[PDB]
Design brief:
Blueprint lengths: L6 H9 L4 E6 L5 E4 L14 H22 L6 H14 L1 H5 L2 H7 L3 H7 L5 E4 L2 E4 L1 H14 L3
Antiparallel strand pairs: 1-2, 3-4
Helix pairs in contact: 1-3, 2-3, 3-7, 5-6
The protein binds chloride ion (CL).
Chloride ion binds next to helix 7.
PDB class: hydrolase
Keywords: lysozyme, peptidoglycan hydrolase, cell morphogenesis, stalk synthesis, hydrolase
Assembly: monomeric
Length: 148
């Protein structure tokens, strides 16, 4: 009973990303393209929205694996899709250790959704700042997560 990210799930994730049709260089010298893709992005590469979709699905493969491996309770497709989006955003390591995952594994779906509110801030020299984009992101993830 392994889950796959649905097309709707992919579109949700893409909705938080900006399409870059042309490879741009990062500080560390690597190249980025599509929806933040780097592993096969090279100097001078160009992508269509179709190509960027394919690359995003490559980047999501280890997230899909992680969520399947870390969640022991049964999930609905919507729950899985939202958790993949969430896990993609915060990273597998943080997801593994998260309040969200703990709740999910306890069968406390509502509390899992609420736990996502803990993931809406960044640190600047030890101070916490709420990120408006993460509030928007969390609202969308939580909505999907809690749709039957
Ligand atoms: Cl919300």
């Amino acid at each position: 009973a392994r889950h796959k990210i649905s097309r709707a799930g992919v579109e949700l994730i893409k909705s938080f990303e900006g399409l870059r049709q042309q490879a741009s260089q990062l500080p560390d010298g690597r190249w980025m393209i599509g929806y933040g893709h780097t592993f096969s992005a090279r100097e001078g590469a160009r992508v269509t929205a179709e190509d960027a979709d394919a690359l995003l699905r490559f980047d999501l493969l280890p997230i899909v694996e992680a969520v399947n491996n870390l969640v022991h309770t049964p999930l609905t497709q919507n729950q899985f899709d939202a958790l993949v989006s969430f896990c993609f955003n915060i990273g597998i390591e943080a997801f593994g250790q998260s309040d969200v995952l703990r709740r999910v594994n306890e069968g406390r779906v509502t509390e899992a959704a609420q736990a996502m509110d803990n993931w809406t801030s960044a640190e600047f020299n030890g101070q916490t700042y709420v990120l408006a984009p993460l509030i928007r992101r969390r609202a969308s993830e939580k909505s999907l997560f809690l749709t039957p």
